[PDB]
Amino acid sequence: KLINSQISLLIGKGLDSLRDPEVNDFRTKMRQFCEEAAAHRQQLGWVEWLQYSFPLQLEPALLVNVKFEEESFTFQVSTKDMPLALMACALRQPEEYALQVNGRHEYLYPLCHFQYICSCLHSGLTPHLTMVHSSSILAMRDEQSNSLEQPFSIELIEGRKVMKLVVQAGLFHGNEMLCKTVSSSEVNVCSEPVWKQRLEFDISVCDLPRMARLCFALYAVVCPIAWANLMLFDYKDQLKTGERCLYMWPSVLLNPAGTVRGNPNTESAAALVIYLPEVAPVYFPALEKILELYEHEKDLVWKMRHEVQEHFPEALARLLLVTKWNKHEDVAQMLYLLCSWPELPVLSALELLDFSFPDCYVGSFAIKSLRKLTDDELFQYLLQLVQVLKYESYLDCELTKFLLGRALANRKIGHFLFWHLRSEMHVPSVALRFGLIMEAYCRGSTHHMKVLMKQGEALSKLKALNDFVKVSSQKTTKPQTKEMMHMCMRQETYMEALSHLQSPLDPSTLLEEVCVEQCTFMDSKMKPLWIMYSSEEAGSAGNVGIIFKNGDDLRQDMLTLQMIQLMDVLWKQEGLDLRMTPYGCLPTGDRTGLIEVVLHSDTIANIQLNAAFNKDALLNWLKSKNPGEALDRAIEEFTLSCAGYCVATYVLGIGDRHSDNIMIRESGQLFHIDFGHFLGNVPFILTYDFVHVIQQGKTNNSEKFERFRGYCERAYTILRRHGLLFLHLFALMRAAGLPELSCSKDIQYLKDSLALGKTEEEALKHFRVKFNEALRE
Ligand SMILES: Cc1nc2c(-c3nnc[nH]3)cc(-c3ccnc(N)c3F)cc2n1-c1ccnc2c(F)ccc(F)c12
Structure with a gap:
């Protein structure tokens, strides 16, 4: 019963009154299911459990400091060495251990592959890890267990x-x-x-x-x-x-x-x-019955149905679009081939999930082609798969069982499925289905529920806090509400509610001690809050900020940053690191969510506001935070990230860029915030004081500039190869009810910016046209 009350607070609705046997069927069927997975889970080997609770965070000479569960030892190791080898040093039997990142939910392949290690290499911080013995991991595992033709x-x-x-x-x-x-x-x-x-x-x-x-x-x-x-x-x-x-x-x-x-x-x-009109008790034929059984262009695709299956397996989609669906024989025949169809590439299934493939057998087929999705791929596409749930016709569907399955097999999957569902529970259309799914998941980890409650209580006191700040600032100076803000935060219940949580933005990041001293808020408009944390265990990787917004819609920004993150993955998976910054961003509720703060960075405008000349401002800030030798890296950091966001902002049609919503890191990496529009709802953008930086400050240095111009063009054609990948996801996203992603013309923005009709070198001469068009500023 307490578990029932807990599920009701977490998911935000009470648990029956509809006496709908569909709803009652969903809950008991999926509960058996989810309890099955949670049972399997408790019986995994301890490295199998790490994979469940702390999935490795990869990407596609070295000092490192290790302790055991207070004395630490520093080593040097090879960027090419395996965590094993590191442990063995630490010991002087390694196989009985894993390396934990200090004060993060992260464990540690050559170390050159581990996100936490590059997030340390590129940034000179020295990795700090902890040897955690396999006895002690088993302890966690254990602690987290529960015929008519009218x-x-x-x-x-x-x-x-x-x-x-x-x-x-x-x-x-x-x-x-x-x-x-x-x-x-x-x-x-x-x-x-x-x-x-x-x-x-x-x-x-x-x-x-x-x-x-x-x-x-x-x-x-x-x-x-x-x-x-x-x-x-x-x-x-x-x-x-x-x-x-x-x-x-x-x-x-x-x-x-x-x-x-x-x-x-x-x-x-x-x-x-x-x-x-009753018509006799008629159930739609079983599958076994069914198996017994320009327009001229459509007709010659229906046509050799078989040759398409034989020789064009991935054209499935457009055979399903020619099928006469009102004719039940046309459908038994098609549906008959589909039970023999060879499985399809993920890209093709991401097209089949769409609403103009309503038939549940094709939906099954699509899901079956999606079981091979790596967990990293699932995570990237996860938002779309959630939005596609709104197209379903029943509560029990392959889609829902697939997510729940994956959610319950990877805790980071489960974490994000939860917040995507939870964030829309205020939407009439979906509240019941999303509520029902969060419920089955909660009977899969009674442990994870309690961790999520914890996140919800913090999100709840952030709401109250912002509300007091909105009211307080109406009557008071910015600094007087600020110190009121801190006094409220200092209360009893706020310290407890806001501290010691997993970050809803990224569960592997821990928010421990809230640093009241360094919290603040934007004194314009929806009063977004700036909340800073620290952790003595994590050291500097414990210093983390989150921005809370109550008033603003964050769905659009979140989609845009997933897309930029997809871009950066596509690019890094063809050798090209534009040194991007896809920072966390997550709707949590009605017009409510979180933004990951990127520390050690500021806005062009704040940097330009001051050098003798405004164009010197950026370069001199860079010169100031990167002494002597180090400037040179910053300039390349700056240059790659520049090109990457130039390409990103252009493809995604993100206008309204100005010196307050473009930011720069001390490493020199430039990145964009506040998206909110996109799809034009734009020309190539470029601004001479950026050009200035890319040219090392020298009036014109066309040996630097042109290669910068080559970055852009390389990015643009890389992305241009995966243009369908981008088209299919956006297609699915039209389900979100995003207002700038409303109709067909929005998706036809992406088609153009990605010159998707034309050839690889005719698009790039056209891309060349925009790029010089934009250079004249
Ligand atoms: C108004 C606003 N919006 C943002 C966004 C953003 N994104 N979508 C939509 N709006 C992103 C980042 C942001 C995000 C990540 N890293 C850094 N450094 C950021 F500034 C900052 C943003 N700000 C802010 C600017 C200045 N002060 C702020 C504050 F005191 C508290 C809260 C605020 F939000 C502040």
Whole structure:
């Protein structure tokens, strides 16, 4: 029971009142499932458990200091040496140990591969680790255990809330209609309106595909009012026969992609009531039955269905787009080949997950092609897979079981699945499904729940704190609310709630002691908070800041930074390190989330605000933080990151860049904050005091500049190869309801910036056109 109450606070809704056997089915089925995984988990070998709880954070001569669970010993080792070898030094049997990063949830392949080690090499800090014996790891593991060929007709009985009242009714597969829409008669505005009018569609009932959905639009004429959709099949495959009442969603005219569950605010939802003509008790045929069984271009793809399977396995997608889905034989045949289809590359499955592949068998097929996804790939695509959950038609689906499975097998997966689900629980459409999934996951780690509660309580006191700061600053100076802010933070409950947590931005980072002294807040607008931490165990890698925002929408920034991080991975996985900074960014709730602070950096504007001439400002700041020899690295740091963000900002169409939202690190790395727009919703950007830095300050030094210009072009064509990768993810993201990612024209921005129609060298001469266009500043 306490566990039940804990799950209810964490996920934000109470745990029944719907007595819906679909919902009851989901919960007990998935709970058995999730408890199975948590059982398996407790029986893993101790290196298998590290892999679960602390997945290694790789990327695609050396001083290092080691202790055991207070005396440390410093060594030198080879950047090429294996953690084993390090341990063996430390011992003077190594296989009985792992290396923990001090004060992080990280354990340690040549050390040149470990994120924490390069985050130390590139930054001169000296790695500090701890030998943790395998007995002691087992302790954690243990501590964390618990036949009918008439036309389909419905009937539109009547309605309930408020010229002339039309209803439009369409039948769709995906966002394709299996026939013609039917409208109603123009009954008069006011009501509670009556229709009692049979609507009959040009489809045989034996020809509704398993995933068919009836879609209504209620509007007003001499203006739209409400929309609503449902499956003609229940979640047990039973064609549904009867009277259903349809609590409608408000509008924008049909909306086949929107949810198949009704508007839950039954107090003000227009209801549309309707009759489903019974027809005999008909369940959609089993799989085994089914297996027994320009337009000229479509016809010659249906055509050699077989040659496509034989010789073009990955063209699956566009054979599924030519398939006549209203014809049940056209579907048995296609669906018959698909049970023999060779598995597909991840890229191709990322296209199949989309909504214009509604059929649940293809969805299964797509999932099956996704079990080979590495955990690092899953993590990169994870946001899209979450948003695709909104397209599903039932609660129990391969997609949900696949995530839960992966979530429960990698704790960093589970961590982020949780926050993605939790962050939308305020959205009517999805609250039930996301709530239900967070619940099954919680019965998979009763331990991780308690860690997440901990994060939630901090996120909760940050909300209160910001609210007091918004109120307090209305009446008071910036410095007077600041010291009030600290007094509130100093209270009892705030110190306890805000301290000793895993960072929701990155669970491997630990937020221990909140440094009240160094907290502050932006005194403009939504009063975003600056919260700083320290940890004596982690040393300097314990000094970490997080920015809290309450008021702003962070979904867009998060997507943009995932994309830049994807870019940097693509680039690093072709040899090219543009030295990017994809900092953490995570919506946690309604207009609420977190930003990872990048320490030791500032804004162009703050740097320009002051040298004799403004162009000297950046270079002199760089000269100041990188003495003598060291400037030279900064200039290359600066130059690569410049090119990388020039390419990134251009592709993603991020305008509105100015000297307050472009930042620079003391290493010389330049990076962008505050995204919020993108897709133009832009020209190549470039600014002579950047040019100035790239040229070592010398008036014009075309031997530096041109190679900088070669960086940009290399990045641009690297990314241009993976343009489909970018197109497919964004396609899935249209499910997010992001306002700048609304329609088709948004995705057609990306198509252009990525010259995706043209050749590799014709796009690069066109890229060359923009780059000089932009240079004249
Ligand atoms: C207003 C604002 N937005 C941001 C963003 C950002 N991102 N999306 C959307 N807005 C990112 C970073 C940021 C992020 C990472 N590293 C560093 N250094 C940053 F400045 C800082 C941001 N700021 C801030 C600038 C100055 N002072 C701030 C403060 F006192 C408290 C909180 C603030 F947010 C501050």
